[PDB]
Design a protein around this nucleic acid. Structure first.
Length: 155
RNA sequence: UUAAUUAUCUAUUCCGUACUU
RNA sequence: GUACGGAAUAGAUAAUUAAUU
């Protein structure tokens, strides 16, 4: 024995990872390697679209998204199935500036999460209002802190 | 040696919104 | 003049997984 879990069980063993990384682990057991190809790269520089294809043995599938991370993610998940066979920060800036208040400021108040995934806690400050948010990135903690503050400063 | 993934920093290119002059 | 967001490319740093030497 000592063999790896089934292709269904490995999904539940590491559901926090991308389907790309699970295909990279599964490929070695079957003697295949998931080859990744960029099928499309176009956009109006404001709403672009990308396409990825993945190849595993005698099978290949595609996926798309507004970024190469989202497009590769969709193409990878599709292979496992066959193998199993507006800005809140900007909206706040417009609100604070329209009411005649001073510009907002952002500062990190905490850090957590292991370095392979990370997390952050960010604070927002306004002329008299203050609020906090969190996320896997400083900008992502900022967008959350702004989203909660939009409820604080608005009616 | 090869493949896959997140975060931080720096540089380059493109695009949008608000405020001010 | 100031503030904010999105996509792509390059360099540096930290972390995680699989295969191989």
């Amino acid at each position: 024995g000592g063999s790896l879990p089934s292709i269904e069980q490995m999904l539940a063993a590491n559901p926090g990872k991308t389907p790309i990384s699970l295909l990279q682990e599964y490929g070695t057991r079957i003697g295949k390697t998931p080859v990744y190809d960029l099928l499309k790269a176009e956009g109006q520089a404001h709403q672009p679209n990308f396409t990825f294809r993945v190849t595993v043995g005698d099978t290949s599938c595609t996926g798309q998204g507004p970024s190469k991370k989202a497009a590769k993610h969709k193409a990878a998940e599709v292979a496992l199935k066959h193998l199993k066979g507006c800005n809140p920060v900007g909206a706040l800036q417009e609100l604070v500036v329209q009411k005649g208040w001073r510009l907002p400021e952002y500062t990190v108040t905490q850090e957590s999460g292991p370095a392979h995934r990370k997390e952050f806690t960010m604070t927002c400050r306004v002329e008299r209002f203050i609020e906090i948010g969190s996320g896997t990135s400083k900008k992502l903690a900022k967008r959350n802190a702004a989203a909660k503050m939009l409820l604080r400063v608005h009616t």
